[PDB]
């Protein structure tokens, strides 16, 4: 405080959304993931840009350039692993951002929630092409099965797969296209994320109680900047723990052998954040059904706001729905466990039952849960 501050027609007023923005006081710790997601996004761009200064997309010198990054570049080994393990932190933070909206009814912000699904699709697409960049027998084959799923579409399935592949199979043509696409997509995410906030600042946050918090708003700057800074450190501590103590804990060991189209890995599987999607697709013998269920499960988020039934909004005072919510989270963990395991007789039964429960809970049990409690509250 020094003057009347004069001026004002500049970009500072746009920054009032970071300083003077009203915010609920009772915002819990499940909310730093909003700022953590922004921290993760600019972290991938920062490390990714320096990775792109030594990475070459040609198949003859793609894998060998990744080795040159770690072996030769000064401090180039850490940058590769905060990039590889940051995407693990990105999807760790991404799934709690979705989970909080499910629990606290944040999907009632229809504009923000719908843009959120678009943001989810963009990152999952971006992280898919990044895995193909190292070209390491998991990049080639992980991209082989997933992209070949598009062949189940009729009258365009074969045409667009080759159009996606740039040829008859995954090869140098596909690899160069992915690196260029992997470079641009994150900058699209920044623009959408700004649009994501633009649809939220009109209505503010969503206190865990679920009631309007207009009576108890507090300034953002002195209270939540220091709360997000602490949350950022817990992210850096968690990310750096993987990088400096178990860099390959999450990544598959088979990715360290150069891609060989003539040789198939013992077990072919995507990264851990797509494993739950793999389980749903593998649960149906049909090919067209599997790809649709793979897309429907991801795209079911847009259908959630149309399934609200409870007269309340947050699950704080909905004990019946709380039991179902953690059943869905547990089932989503069962899908992750199933995806990393080979298709044999103990897992086909478990995989089909978990997948049929994943859709049954959200489509039937959860809307019926809200209706039941409405009778129990005389409204």
């Amino acid at each position: 405080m020094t003057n009347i501050r004069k001026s004002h027609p500049l970009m500072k007023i746009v920054n009032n959304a970071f300083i003077d923005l009203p915010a609920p006081s009772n915002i819990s710790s499940w909310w730093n993931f909003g700022s953590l997601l922004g921290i993760c996004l600019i972290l991938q761009i920062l490390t990714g840009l320096f990775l792109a200064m030594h990475y070459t997309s040609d198949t003859t010198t793609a894998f060998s350039s990744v080795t040159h990054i770690c072996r030769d570049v000064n401090y180039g080994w850490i940058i590769r692993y905060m990039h590889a393990n940051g995407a693990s932190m990105f999807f760790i933070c991404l799934y709690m951002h979705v989970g909080r909206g499910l629990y606290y009814g944040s999907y009632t912000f229809l504009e923000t929630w719908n843009i959120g699904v678009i943001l989810l699709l963009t990152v999952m697409a971006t992280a898919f092409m990044g895995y193909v960049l190292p070209w390491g027998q998991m990049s080639f084959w992980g991209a082989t099965v997933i992209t070949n799923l598009l062949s189940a579409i009729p009258y365009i399935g074969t045409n667009l797969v080759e159009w996606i592949w740039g040829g008859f199979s995954v090869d140098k043509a596909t690899l160069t296209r992915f690196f260029a696409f992997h470079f641009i997509l994150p900058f699209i995410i920044m623009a959408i994320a700004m649009v994501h906030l633009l649809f939220l600042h009109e209505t503010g946050s969503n206190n865990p109680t679920g009631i309007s918090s207009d009576v108890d708003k507090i300034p953002f700057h002195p209270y939540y900047t220091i709360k997000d800074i602490l949350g950022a450190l817990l992210l850096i501590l968690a990310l750096m723990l993987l990088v400096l103590f178990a860099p390959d804990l999450l990544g598959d060991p088979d990715n360290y052998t150069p891609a060989n189209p003539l040789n198939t890995p013992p077990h072919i599987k995507p990264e851990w954040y797509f494993l739950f999607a793999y389980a749903i697709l593998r649960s149906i013998p049909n090919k067209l059904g599997g790809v649709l269920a793979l897309a429907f499960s991801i795209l079911i988020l847009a259908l959630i706001p149309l399934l609200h039934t409870s007269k309340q909004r947050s699950m704080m005072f909905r004990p019946l729905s709380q039991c179902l919510f953690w059943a869905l989270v547990a089932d989503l963990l069962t899908l992750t466990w199933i995806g990393g395991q080979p298709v044999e007789h103990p897992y086909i039964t478990i995989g089909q039952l978990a997948s049929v429960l994943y859709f049954l809970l959200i489509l039937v049990l959860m809307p019926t849960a809200g209706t039941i409690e409405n009778k129990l509250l005389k409204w």
Binding site: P22, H201, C323, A327, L333, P346
Partner: protein, 82 residues
């Protein structure tokens, strides 16, 4: 963004008191009442959080047990003999 302090809502007949952050301890009664609080909080949610994840471990402890049993050979050497 068309919304700021001044027009948020109409609040009447409510008095609040607060202290300077320098005149109060940052960590007051941390373990004196915080620890008994967390026990209260955990009980209020352990009946809605634990059972869904307890079942998953039961699936884990059985889905993996059956998988090794499948890989294990079974004594079906009869009908061939010597």
């Amino acid at each position: 963004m068309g919304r700021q302090f001044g027009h948020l809502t109409r609040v009447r007949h409510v008095i609040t008191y607060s202290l300077s952050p320098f005149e109060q301890r940052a960590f007051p009664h941390y373990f004196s009442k915080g620890i008994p609080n967390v026990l209260r909080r955990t009980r209020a949610c352990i009946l809605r959080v634990a059972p869904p994840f307890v079942a998953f471990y039961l699936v884990y402890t059985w889905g993996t047990q059956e998988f090794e049993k499948s890989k294990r050979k079974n004594p079906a050497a009869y009908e061939n003999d010597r």
